[PDB]
Design an enzyme around this catalytic site. Structure first.
Site, mmCIF file in Angstrom:
data_model
loop_
_atom_site.group_PDB
_atom_site.id
_atom_site.type_symbol
_atom_site.label_atom_id
_atom_site.label_comp_id
_atom_site.label_asym_id
_atom_site.label_seq_id
_atom_site.Cartn_x
_atom_site.Cartn_y
_atom_site.Cartn_z
ATOM 1 N N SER A 154 -5.080 3.946 3.906
ATOM 2 C CA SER A 154 -4.764 3.998 3.055
ATOM 3 C C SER A 154 -6.187 2.507 2.870
ATOM 4 C CB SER A 154 -3.872 2.044 3.638
ATOM 5 O OG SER A 154 -3.164 2.051 3.142
ATOM 6 N N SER A 205 0.357 -1.668 -0.391
ATOM 7 C CA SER A 205 -0.306 0.562 0.158
ATOM 8 C C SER A 205 0.995 1.477 -0.137
ATOM 9 C CB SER A 205 -0.902 0.002 1.241
ATOM 10 O OG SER A 205 -2.263 -0.697 1.087
ATOM 11 N N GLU A 241 -4.435 -7.446 -6.411
ATOM 12 C CA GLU A 241 -2.963 -8.442 -6.940
ATOM 13 C C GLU A 241 -2.379 -7.993 -7.197
ATOM 14 O OE1 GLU A 241 -5.652 -9.415 -7.944
ATOM 15 O OE2 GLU A 241 -6.859 -8.794 -9.917
ATOM 16 N N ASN A 248 -8.693 0.793 0.486
ATOM 17 C CA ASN A 248 -8.231 0.374 -0.583
ATOM 18 C C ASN A 248 -9.376 1.902 -1.793
ATOM 19 O OD1 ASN A 248 -6.078 -0.915 -0.952
ATOM 20 N ND2 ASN A 248 -7.745 -2.180 0.616
#
Length: 268
Positions: free
Chosen positions: A105, A45, A143, A107
């Site tokens: 963080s 991340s 991924e 997503n």
């Protein structure tokens, strides 16, 4: 001026069961601490900090980019979207998405912003534009955190991370308002209290961005630190380990940060 004072990084990574990469720069004297600093480690991340900087760079050419409202569907919400999930029914501005990507963080926020920049190649292009020839983002999220041993996709080096972080937070890669905004987002990070920050005295300012891939003992943190009465320090600490099930360690990251500060002669 590199490694004037040796520090026991090898013993630390051996106890951890993997590899630790460290680069730390005293921006006053130019002295550095360097251990596995040019090896590649997965970004995990931690790419999201540079993503937010790339958005800020674009905002220099697009007034009002940061205030643009972005609405998204439930399909955008992927695991660990703690801020954007609370604004699904309303939308969030580009600036709010950037803050969430850096400080939580988030997503979903990072994916929305990566799309805006033209994907992994667009973020890589931004890093090339500031002189970073090491960084590469290759895949979209989830991924990109596979952290496969020997796979250079979605990796950088501790050195290039530190060099780029210095250019963006202290140098001239961003205009001054955008630079201070990037610093402020890093200072407000909530996910790094047990990493570099744990090595930094409470009366020093610090901003950071973390990463944790969840496999191969792979986790990281990079930070700018402002010790009082001297020039700032920029540093990066990345880890990995050989086995998929190997666990990451926050304590090892904090310990490596302490060794880096000791190696630079920073009393802390």
């Amino acid at each position: 001026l590199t490694n004037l004072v040796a520090e026991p990084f090898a013993k630390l990574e051996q106890d951890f069961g993997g590899s630790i990469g460290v680069y730390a720069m005293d921006t006053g004297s130019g002295a550095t601490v360097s251990y596995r600093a040019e090896e590649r480690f997965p970004l995990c991340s931690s790419f999201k900090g540079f993503l937010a900087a790339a958005v800020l760079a674009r905002s220099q050419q697009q007034a009002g980019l940061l205030d643009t409202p972005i609405r998204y569907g439930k399909n955008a919400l992927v695991p660990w979207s703690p801020i954007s999930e609370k604004y699904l029914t309303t939308g969030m501005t580009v600036a709010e998405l950037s803050a969430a990507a850096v400080q939580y963080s988030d997503n979903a926020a990072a994916n929305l912003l990566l799309k805006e920049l033209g994907g992994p190649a667009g973020l890589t292009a931004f890093m090339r534009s500031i002189g970073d020839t090491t960084f590469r983002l290759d895949r979209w999220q989830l991924e990109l955190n596979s952290a496969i041993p020997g796979d250079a996709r979605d990796t950088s080096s501790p050195r290039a991370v530190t060099e780029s972080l210095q250019k963006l937070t202290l140098g001239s890669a961003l205009a001054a308002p955008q630079r201070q905004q990037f610093v402020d987002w890093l200072k407000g990070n909530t996910t790094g209290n047990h990493r570099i920050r744990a090595a930094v005295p409470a009366d020093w300012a610090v901003g950071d961005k973390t990463g944790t891939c969840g496999v191969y003992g792979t986790a990281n943190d990079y930070a700018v630190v402002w010790p009082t009465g001297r020039a700032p320090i920029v540093l990066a600490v990345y880890t990995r380990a050989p086995n998929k099930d190997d666990k990451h360690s926050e304590a090892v990251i904090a310990a490596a940060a302490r060794l880096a500060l000791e190696g630079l002669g920073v009393n802390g």
